[PDB]
Amino acid sequence: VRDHWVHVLVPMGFVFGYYLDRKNDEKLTAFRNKSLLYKRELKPNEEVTWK
Amino acid sequence: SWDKDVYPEPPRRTPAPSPQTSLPNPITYLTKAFDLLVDRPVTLVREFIERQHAKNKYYYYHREFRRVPDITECQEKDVLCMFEAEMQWRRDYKVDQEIVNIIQERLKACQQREGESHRQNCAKELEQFTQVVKAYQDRYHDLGAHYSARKCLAKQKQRMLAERKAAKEA
Amino acid sequence: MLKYIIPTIMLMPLTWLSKNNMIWVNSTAHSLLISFTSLLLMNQFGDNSLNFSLLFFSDSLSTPLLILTMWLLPLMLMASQHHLSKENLTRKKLFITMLISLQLFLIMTFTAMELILFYILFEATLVPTLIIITRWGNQTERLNAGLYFLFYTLAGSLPLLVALIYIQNTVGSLNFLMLQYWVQPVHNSWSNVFMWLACMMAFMVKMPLYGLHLWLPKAHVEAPIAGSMVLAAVLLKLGGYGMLRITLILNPMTDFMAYPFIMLSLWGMIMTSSICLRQTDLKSLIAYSSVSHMALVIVAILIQTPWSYMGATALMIAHGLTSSMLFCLANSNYERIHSRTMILARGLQTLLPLMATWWLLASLTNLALPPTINLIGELFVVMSTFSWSNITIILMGVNMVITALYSLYMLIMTQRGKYTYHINNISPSFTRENALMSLHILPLLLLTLNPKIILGPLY
Amino acid sequence: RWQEDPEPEDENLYEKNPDSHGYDKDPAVDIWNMRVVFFFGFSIVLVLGSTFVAYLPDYRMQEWARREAERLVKYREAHGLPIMESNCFDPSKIQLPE
Amino acid sequence: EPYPDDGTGYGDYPKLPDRSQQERDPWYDWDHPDLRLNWGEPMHWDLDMYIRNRVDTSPTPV
Amino acid sequence: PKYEASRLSSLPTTLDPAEYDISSETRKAQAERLAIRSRLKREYQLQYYDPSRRGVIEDPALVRWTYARSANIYPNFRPNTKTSLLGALFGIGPLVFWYYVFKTDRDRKEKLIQEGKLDRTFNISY
Amino acid sequence: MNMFSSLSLVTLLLLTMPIMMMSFNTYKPSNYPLYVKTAISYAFITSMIPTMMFIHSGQELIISNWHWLTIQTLKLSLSFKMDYFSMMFIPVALFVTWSIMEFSMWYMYSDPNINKFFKYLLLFLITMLILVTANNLFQLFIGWEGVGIMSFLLIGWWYGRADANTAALQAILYNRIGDIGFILAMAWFLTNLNTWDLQQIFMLNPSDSNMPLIGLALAATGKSAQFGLHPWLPSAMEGPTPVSALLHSSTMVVAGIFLLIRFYPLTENNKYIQSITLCLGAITTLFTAMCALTQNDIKKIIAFSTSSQLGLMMVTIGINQPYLAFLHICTHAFFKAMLFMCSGSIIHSLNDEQDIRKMGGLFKAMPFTTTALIVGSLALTGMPFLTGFYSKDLIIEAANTSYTNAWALLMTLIATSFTAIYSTRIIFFALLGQPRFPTLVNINENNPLLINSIKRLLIGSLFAGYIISNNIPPTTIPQMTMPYYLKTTALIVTILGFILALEISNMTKNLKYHYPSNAFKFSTLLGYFPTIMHRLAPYMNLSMSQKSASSLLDLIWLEAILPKTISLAQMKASTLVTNQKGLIKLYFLSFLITILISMILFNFHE
Ligand SMILES: CCCCCCCCCCCCO[C@@H]1O[C@H](CO)[C@@H](O[C@H]2O[C@H](CO)[C@@H](O)[C@H](O)[C@H]2O)[C@H](O)[C@H]1O
Ligand SMILES: CCCCCCCCCCCCO[C@@H]1O[C@H](CO)[C@@H](O[C@H]2O[C@H](CO)[C@@H](O)[C@H](O)[C@H]2O)[C@H](O)[C@H]1O
Ligand SMILES: CCCCCCCCCCCCO[C@@H]1O[C@H](CO)[C@@H](O[C@H]2O[C@H](CO)[C@@H](O)[C@H](O)[C@H]2O)[C@H](O)[C@H]1O
Ligand SMILES: CCCCCCCCCCCCO[C@@H]1O[C@H](CO)[C@@H](O[C@H]2O[C@H](CO)[C@@H](O)[C@H](O)[C@H]2O)[C@H](O)[C@H]1O
């Protein structure tokens, strides 16, 4: 609607911001399942421990 | 509901009623009224709620932290090892705060329970409180707001050096 | 933090692309939504901070300051939209843009992992703040207040820049997580004395420390209401937050370097509290009250104990809401009588009964009635300074007496007594004004039920 | 002196709109402004936000620490060990100077 | 009569009697009855210290 | 027993010897005081009673008072032997006084702790 | 236990319900005062059940129901101490407040904000109960400051009156000065014992308790208006009469004494603290009784009566008889509240006249208020077997036979004689002789709210002391062997006080005109303490604020030493640089000087 299309700007900014925060995590996986505290074996269907 | 060894309680000794009067005890009748008017309806509501809970049983767990090398085994400036050693130290520090709280809780319950005989009957709790507070003070006191495993280790070594020095001259 | 930076940025296209008559409605609604999402930063752990990326992290210190910052933006829009009604549309949007850009800098400032990044954003907040005061302030003296504000900050912050760059050369990093592990003790020397002063003076000027506080009463008397709210609520806390971080790398030199600044604060708070008893301008009185409350925070930060750091954090949050309330209360009188003179309009409880309740509640938090978080913060500081030296309780106790006297004096003078006969335009409190007051006090009093979330990392 | 406009008279919003909420001169905008503030401010942020805070999952691990302390106090007292030792770190891992 | 010209900073502001407002006539029709002030009359430099809630300088029977 | 006035207890007006010895020159002055008061009263009442007025009757006396109590001080300030000695006495002096009070207290406390003569048996909160 | 703990909490929750109903949920504004009064009366019933259980078997318990906050090793929980002192005080406070609230429904009938008035009375009572049942110092501090702030709002009830606002702030000022002691004790107990809980404080039982106890003594001084921080209590008569009745009996003023009673396990081992409280109480009881001798305002005489009776409680603390001090709190609540209620009855009938010199001839005109006033005066003066006798007389015997400061003992006995004199003064001038009030007679005490409320306190003023003394369990070894002249000293000095008071009163009828003495002026003007202290100290502080702190420092020298002087230097420097004549000759001449200097002086050519 031409009346209420401005109301998606900030909610879409949050979704885009949320998405980019998750993308940031994919660049910081050098130690995923490699810390002495949390390192373990993968479950049969598990590919990664977190994403 | 809780572990009786962690939060101990002596066996309760209640005297039996031994009236020496013909008057009725108003507390006895209020107790009956309270049991009939308050407790029984409350119990019925709870038992309904507990039946619903029994239909949806599910569980939660106490997180287990594997031990990792402590700050003594970390090479200088090796942040990756320091980080894991530091986080472990912080978790232990929080646990030691709650151990002191458990002992303080034991001490406070003994004081109230023993009434006017508390100065004599609470010696064991007082002694345990004194020892844990001393142990806690040695570990953590004086480290400052920016405390760390490094500063804790430095304090311990200062204490160790003082203990060795005195032992030599003896 | 991108989930907060981007929607904050999107507030600017929203304001500029809104219908002419819907700029306040739209900007207020969506900045409240941003404030709602900021509660996700409460995912805090007992050992580790919330480390988002290479640029931004959040911990128990920055999280409460972040939530206060994002909550204040909709409150500032509510407070400003009335005195800006005559302003033309484009300049209204420019005003809102300055508020939005201030929030963007603030949320980045409080989450910046690297100290030089923190510096740039810490400095960037000056620009919009100065524009708000000088462009939209009401009186001739806003120009002087702008200059004093600008040059007091830069006189201290430029030496901080040199010190920060020097630290990075010596240590190799300014990442705050790195400094936690590579920190080395600061040895005695004249070079280290001036490194300490360069690292601290900029934050002292912002707090402000007694003796470097004269810019703040000026700034408040000249700023528009929104300027006063953000100045008192958040911008002062940039100094406290900065000090809480940088003191990590100044040990053990802080042991003796803090003495002159503890004396200035301990004696400063009694002087500024006493000064409040004689102030004739209501905004100036609230401004001097801030200097006294923040003198406690400086002492707490400088003595570096777990109790003092917890008290400092709670005080910063509690004062932020209380002082912002008091300015909003004083402004609502100004919008009727157009004077800041405290003695001009008296006996307002007779004419504005509900507004007098907000006045009472604000005053009670200002004097730290238990169990408000204002009292929790003050008490934790008093407990920790007693161990530092038992004699401080006398100074702390005297300030508590004087604080009650001037807080209730302000309440008595303006709300009680006889109303001024010739002031016949005291129109009933608007829904907007009542909602603005309650949006301060209600979160403030609700925090008493779960104080741990405003107690900081040392909790 | 110069050619300058006179100071306008301050306008009481209640004259034109006795129902004014004090947000806007336009009654329709005024009512909407009141509604977003009251709904997003009180109904959402303060009510749901307060509820959200009330149910934060063990904020900063305080509850886990108490459970962990109980486990250690139980095990240590059963085995006749000190509840807590003065040494945070094992002395055998430390090499003192001199 | 101005305050003595030292460095204090009074300027030309009048020095008025160091008397509390409580000493003013309570039956006269003051423009400000609570303060016992008339519109336009010069205010004592320390008027805020001499309001009826604060410092009294009234004659005492002893 | 004569009345002795003090700063905080004024001489009663009925015991003031100047109250009774009233000359034609003193009555002339009292008349001029009442003329200023009456002129200001009329100026006020003309606005106070005006049915069309809504707002605040600005009082220049109040504005002059608030202006004098702030902005007018520094322009009329002169650094001289009085303000410098009062400036030093109550500006630097208290800071030096408190510095020595707290510094002495903390040195004494720290010396006892290091020697182990300060009782900190249950002190684990700080 | 389940009934005991459940019912003790329901009492406190019951009192909060009328406050919660102010959210307009299910409210009946028509008669909010009746609703509040009914809640108090029902709370009194529920509180008698656990009180009865304690009397039977000594059942005591602590309820730590809600964990509020843990600060490392300091865990703060909402904890309630349902012990001896809270079990006996709560029913007394509720019973007295029940009469005061019923009385206020008549006294405040024409007040447009009566609903708000009853809300403030209820909030007053709630903060006191928080104070009395608190098991840790932070919770106690909540009630401590709560009653102070409620005192401020109720003393300044008629806020258009400058004197009311002054009195209200004065109570805050003096109580905050006492609060310095309270925070001192909190800081000491945390630093040295790692706790704010009474259990841990008593278990660790420090021997070096001078500092924490002096802090508590200072807190009690302010709250109970002991000498030094005393003037605020007589000034609190600015408030409506129901405020004074509640303030002076069941709430604000006894809090200071109660604080010291709660810490008797520490004070009983500290003879230095005992000496201080003994002498502080003795000068208070003597000095304020002396002031009452010449007061003419009826509310002020009774106000000074409270200060004198509070000083006696502080003496009882001094001689290490905490349970006797507590008993006096409970007995004093009945007849002191009645005395204010009777005075309010007189004031109302005489169209707000409070000067006893304008009363007189009321013995038959107001028969019921007369009966209550006489009974209350006899209970206050220790007439045998009335409520006041079961505490005061035991206190006097305990003091007489104790190892104690001889001067403090004498001051206390004289103050007991002065109690008889100033009670005689009220009866003589208010009730006897001929009327001295105006001609249009509007005397009328026939309202059932007035009669019934005073009636219940009259019954308490006769039997409450006997009933309480016969049910509480012994916790001391009462001293019952003494010479005849130490056993009857209280009765004799009281009787001599009555006789001497009658000589003075009757001499005012002789057609002889007398000049005033210095002693009379000293008594009337309250020892000049308010006149000197309330002018001098505010003047000195307020003068320092504007002259030195604000103007001298913040508007002058802190300006001068930096921003003002720095700007001058740059402006002067700029005029040096820019004031050039624009002459080619002068500029190139400076080039030559620069090149020469660069070589000869600085050797830049090397
Ligand atoms: C998750 C995102 C949440 C964002 C929340 C944003 C809240 C925004 C509130 C907007 C207020 C409504 O805004 C307004 O609504 C009405 C009805 O829809 C619109 O339409 C109106 O036009 C005219 C009025 O002139 C009339 O036909 C009628 O009053 C109405 O239909 C307006 O053109 C619009 O300006
Ligand atoms: C390839 C690079 C270029 C990329 C360009 C991408 C965006 C292009 C947008 C083109 C349309 C812009 O639209 C043009 O500007 C604004 C917003 O619409 C409109 O005018 C505006 O006036 C006011 C605000 O000032 C509001 O009522 C409303 O926002 C709108 O009506 C103009 O009437 C329209 O002509
Ligand atoms: C210690 C760290 C911080 C130090 C900061 C100090 C830097 C200087 C800050 C203020 C800069 C303002 O720059 C200039 O200052 C002077 C006064 O100082 C102002 O001038 C003002 O005070 C002067 C002196 O009383 C008056 O003559 C003048 O009428 C008045 O306007 C100028 O209008 C302003 O342009
Ligand atoms: C810690 C280091 C901080 C370094 C900061 C450097 C800030 C430099 C600020 C600009 C300095 C010049 O600023 C200029 O100063 C002079 C003197 O005060 C002011 O001059 C003003 O005050 C003087 C002093 O009474 C008056 O005589 C004059 O009539 C008035 O105009 C100018 O109005 C101001 O524009």
XYZ file of C-alpha atoms in Angstrom, chain A residues 2-3 6-8 10-14 16-18 20-21 24 26 31-32 38 41 46 48-50:
25
model
C 1.265 3.489 -0.817
C 0.007 4.684 2.579
C 7.261 3.108 4.976
C 6.400 0.883 7.945
C 8.482 -1.986 6.520
C 12.774 -0.565 10.041
C 11.407 -4.129 10.343
C 13.293 -5.061 7.171
C 16.363 -3.325 8.558
C 16.145 -5.659 11.540
C 18.682 -7.665 7.160
C 20.726 -6.833 10.247
C 19.854 -10.165 11.838
C 24.179 -10.169 8.368
C 24.957 -10.962 12.009
C 29.376 -12.805 10.397
C 30.303 -18.135 9.296
C 37.368 -23.243 16.407
C 33.912 -24.764 15.936
C 33.378 -28.169 24.236
C 32.308 -36.167 18.495
C 25.214 -33.747 12.552
C 28.502 -29.079 12.361
C 27.984 -28.456 16.060
C 26.649 -24.916 15.571
